[PDB]
Write a structure and sequence with these properties.
Chain A: InterPro entries: KH_dom-like_a/b (IPR015946), OHR (IPR019953), OsmC/Ohr_fam (IPR003718), OsmC/Ohrsf (IPR036102). Two copies of one chain form a homodimer. By secondary structure, chain A is of the alpha+beta class. Chain A folds into two domains: 48 residues, Single Sheet (N-terminal domain of TfIIb), CATH 2.20.25.10; 97 residues, K homology (KH) domain (GMP Synthetase, Chain A, domain 3). The first copy, chain A, is 30% helix and 28% strand. Chain A has three helices and seven strands. In chain A, strands 4-5-6-7 form a four-stranded mixed beta sheet, with helices on one face. In chain A, strands 1-2-3 form a three-stranded antiparallel beta sheet, with no helix packed on it. In chain A, helix 1 crosses helix 2. Chains A and B meet through strand 1, strand 2, helix 1, strand 4 and strand 5 of A and strand 1, strand 2, helix 1, strand 4 and strand 5 of B. Strand 4 of chain A pairs antiparallel with strand 1 of chain B, so a sheet runs across the interface.
């Protein structure tokens, strides 16, 4: 099954107590941030927020996954720029939902690029986490997957 | 998974970020509110000098879930001054050639027993990160040391 972490290779942890409006940090204090509401949600937009954090994390994870598959395919790829776009809105059941698009730009003939990025979307742990909940809109060199 | 409980019916807020990861990677939001360097952790072949997506997920989920608890408490007019949440995020191989995350959310709150179970249970239904991972990650939620 694509969901079971069968053996933990790396573990981290973080604590927050003021939700979207205060501090959050990894317990080892390696990553420490102030959070605030964006202007769109009535805030100052003076700091980051969980949607941005998810965008940054997923872009990074997906980029890493593409570079991983490239390595395994012995395809020299210097960079794998990924732009992640994350939205939030109400789900109509009283909760909230995320929407995600991922746009990868890769220096390979398009069918080869599609093959790499398609495999990467299978192996990426953020993709595995959200599969079936978020229909992630993935494109490669401007073409929809 | 439940696609309907994760339908964004009207976007309140949208944001973008672009990563050129690997090592030594960088990632930035389009508005520059967040600019970070990236590293693989030492446990996964890297230098662990900068941040990584599991840290980013831990921070995001801890904050989102703390907020969800505060949100429901407010709706319930249950006085909470704060809602401490520790999110623990692990990564390892799945059986199929990819990787999967494990998540635990430990709330440490001034409310107890079945009232607390009820409140944090609602929070876990409302929280957008919880809706995003439902069924895929068996998120291990606890309140004051006790399973949800």
């Amino acid at each position: 099954m694509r969901n079971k972490n069968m053996s933990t290779i790396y573990q981290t942890s973080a604590t927050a107590s003021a939700g979207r409006n205060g501090v959050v940090s990894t317990e080892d204090k390696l990553l420490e941030l102030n959070l605030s509401y964006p202007k769109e949600m009535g805030g100052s937009g003076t700091a980051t927020n969980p949607e941005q954090l998810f965008a940054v994390g997923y872009a990074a994870c997906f980029s890493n996954a593409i570079l991983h598959v490239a390595r395994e395919a012995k395809v020299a790829l210097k960079e794998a720029p990924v732009t992640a776009t994350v939205g939030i809105g109400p789900n109509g059941q009283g909760g909230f939902a995320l929407s995600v698009a991922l746009a990868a730009h890769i220096a390979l003939e398009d069918e080869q690029a599609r093959q790499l990025v398609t495999v990467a979307h299978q192996v990426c742990p953020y993709s595995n986490a959200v599969r079936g909940n978020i229909d992630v809109q993935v494109s490669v060199n401007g073409l929809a997957l």
